[model samples]
Target: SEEICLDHLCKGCPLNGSCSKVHFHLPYRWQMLIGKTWTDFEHMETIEKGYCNPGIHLCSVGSYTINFRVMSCDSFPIRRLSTPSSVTKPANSVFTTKWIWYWKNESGTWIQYGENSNVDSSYLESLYQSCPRGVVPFQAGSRNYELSFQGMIQTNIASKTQKDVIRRPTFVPQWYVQQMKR
Candidate 1:
């Protein structure tokens, strides 16, 4: 999550109460993810500063839809919540949010793929509750999918006697459901 100051206000008393009081207004924090390779993330950050350029890439040959979940974090007391809210209180805690990138295959059928989750929820609750359950039609025309890209800075290398380096491959497979109607 990120916080940006939007505005500031200062109030003064008639006789100069204590001097002046100042309050700052902050913009809502947001996070997102895109479907792209590790190299893509590195290159884009060098050129601009986002995951995947602001363009469409063919994931499969028909109609497709992209899905994502955006939640307001202005209400949570803690920056990160211990667990997913029970749907009663405001969702302010950090959670793993999901997004989908869709495309049409050569068969003219819609196919869907899961976009990366912005935050790693392996230690926290997932973002399933944040998104609605249903397949939203993805537009065929141009669309922009971008997010701040922080490249992998370092990798561990081992000697011959040591075990070979364990490389964490990018684009780990996950699950999602898409629907098409006749």
Candidate 2:
């Protein structure tokens, strides 16, 4: 007997795992763009520099757009693994948590950061404090859901074609994620 896979591995992909022998991978940008509807991606492309650029003063057609892709849903809260050491040591969970947050700069490229990176401590802390709820197979709680960067630059290509263009997106963002107090 055979069955079809209907999860994150399936939804964002264009091919069926059961039908294809080759392994399928969702490009970071494609994965981020895949939403409840195809139109969602189309709408994001319209954003321009004036309305989209968040921090950097550089002038460009591209804008930083945050696309929230909910990886899963659940009723209760779920905390991510805090450290690699804990995975093997297995102790009283005394260590702090960790997560990979992707960011892009004026260079028009992508970068990743974690609670254990050279990034600012207060910045990571703020993110942890901001969206703390995560869950599975249910609602009312946030899960693997992550942000996808979009509308940074305009082009002749349509949003649909851009999905296959191979460039992951997302930037929960910098400076903006944290509030500035005077």
Candidate 3:
């Protein structure tokens, strides 16, 4: 596709203020989590604060995939509910947990990348190759759900490690859910 480049600050010798940043859309929010080996994930401690979607995981898509409302449709796109902060959960099992994407540096500290960070997808391809179960709609017997405080434990068809899921619905205010980050 041949095209001309312009800008919103185009007050110079061109199309005046008619020029603008090209806007586009990403069809889906989280396309996929490609990784090899049974992946281990964490949603961080800040998650426990504000009680913003704590102790919750998804059984719908991408097993054990973390839940986030921050992904803008303007950016990528992506919510699921779960238990409350007061509820006590079983060990080695979280109501919800996500495999955060990070790269440990030489110092062994995990690093996070900004949206505009220059990342070599191919280099990190293998790390995300073997995705956890329930990542796709094409597969059979994905997501092996265990049990929750209110539900029964389900045996995961993919792994011996199973999880429990609980469904809780209530009226929640905005400010009550202040800090929810990756």
Candidate 4:
């Protein structure tokens, strides 16, 4: 039988409508970290006294698009949503992490990004790759698929074993249906 559970009552969890006994009660946090950092939730280091500090730089707010073709293919544009938000530096020895949103844009596209870029030997690739971990199936993309993703730190354990870890949004991530009339 179809259930009748309201989101407000279920706190809007995916199990909302299916569970009758125990609803997934969670304020389930999103962000967590891995590796080390340049500074922290306390203070920051600078180029004068720290490593490659971006020095208070923030991304420019606007549509930053890179529309390119794979030559033999129809389209394989790597699109991303770069906010004016600064790439945050944590209170520890953090690795270089960036949420790289990508698309197999059209069924005609090629060249996958993230995980299937598949080199986990580097800390940078391993870190940001975790952002799209379960959000989408690891694929070389058969046809078209797109997703928005955020949040990740490292591939180490000290970051994954606690509830006290610094956090970010890990849920379906502002899910957007990318479509167009063009």
Candidate 5:
């Protein structure tokens, strides 16, 4: 059987060196499971972009969880962990980071999944407590997630990360769902 490539299915699939953005218009409370562990944070802010790929959509009410994985770029380990030291200051190093979001429509539903779920929630009543504020580093070889409410919207790093740079995948959640349906 001839396999159909992603680009053929979606007109604007994210290509190499391109990033995809997702924006969530919060009508109510929501939760997400980030597939990576939180370590040191550079900063985190809400922006006008979507987290998932171009085709993907926000998790449906019944969907239990979603998972996003980071790309394994050679520069990721150094950029994510390196600090200022007199001994070594590497240049021209590239790093890539990826994220997976696992979410459930119902509150506390993720607890059933067991430990290391990395799930959190945000509500309309307490917006500050629900959403993440700044970029944080991932624990060395750690996979965890946090939950926060986002009234404005947030962005996701689909593939690569660099100094003051984040790359996104072109494939959106909606497109992935469409492919699943077919």
Candidate 6:
């Protein structure tokens, strides 16, 4: 097996480096964009060359189009305090789950994407409430899904309108911070 160092030295390796191990430039942001939002879609288009990556999953609801990567993890930590149900593994990721996403903005540079499920329901609620008439964004939880080309058209989840969004304490717990630490 081979391993690439995730450090700042070689942008990810040792100062002297090694031939056997693999090492490349740091800030791999070129191929892999992180934290970008729909607000930054156009900018991303330019950077990504004409259009955003079509290999990933994306869906459109109302006027906004959302692109996200399906996330799978060993531990499904919710709010850093409670774990998901025994049967629940971070399987079905949603806007309310902790995962990376994409979108285009009205006008601006890339806006980082991703949301910690720990945040209060109001965060996602804001997006729901701001949508234009007859359009509501919703993606039912699913562990398996085919890669959506460009962006798929999604119908509004009627049930979302009748039920209140789940409310949870707002906090980006230490564990979340630890993962992104340099």
Q: Pick the candidate with the highest TM-score.
A: 6
Question: Tens-digit lDDT track for model 4 on 10-79?
Answer: 2343654555422211211111122342111111111111111112112211232111121111122221
The runs of at least 3 residues in candidate 4 whose Cα sits more than 4 Å from the true structure, single-residue gaps closed, are 1-88, 91-98, 103-112, 119-182
Rank by lDDT (best first):
6, 3, 2, 5, 4, 1
Give all TM-scores, in the order shown.
Answer: 0.15, 0.19, 0.17, 0.15, 0.15, 0.20
Candidate 4: deviation at residue 63, Å? 18
TM-score preference between candidates 4 and 6, better one: 6
Can you write out model 5's per-residue Cα lDDT over 8-89, one digit (the tens) per residue?
A: 2324335533423222111111233234632221121111023334223322222222221232222221112211111122
lDDT of 2 by residue, 1-182 (tens): 11212222233335544443223121111112224432122222222221123332222222333322222112111111112222222344222122333344337653443322343323433433454342111111221222222322212222221211112222322232123110
Q: Return the lDDT, model 2, position 38.
A: 20
Quality of model 1 by C-alpha lDDT = 0.21
The runs of at least 3 residues in candidate 1 whose Cα sits more than 4 Å from the true structure, single-residue gaps closed, are 1-94, 114-182
Candidate 1, poorest ten consecutive residues by summed lDDT:
173-182
lDDT of each: 0.21, 0.26, 0.27, 0.24, 0.25, 0.28
- Candidate structures ordered by TM-score, highest first: 6, 2, 3, 5, 4, 1
Question: For each predicted model, how many residue pairs clash, with residues at least 3 apart or on different chains?
Answer: 5, 10, 20, 10, 42, 12
Best by lDDT: 6
lDDT score, residue 73, model 2? 18
Query: Model 3, stretches more than 4 Å misplaced?
Result: 1-100, 113-182
Q: Residue 108: error of model 5 in Å?
A: 28
Scored by lDDT, model 4 comes in at 0.24
Which has the higher TM-score value, candidate number 1 or candidate number 6? 6
Candidate 4: C-alpha RMSD after superposition: 20.0
Error of 2 at 101 (Å): 2.9
What is the lDDT for 30 in model 5? 21
TM-score between candidate 4 and the true structure: 0.15
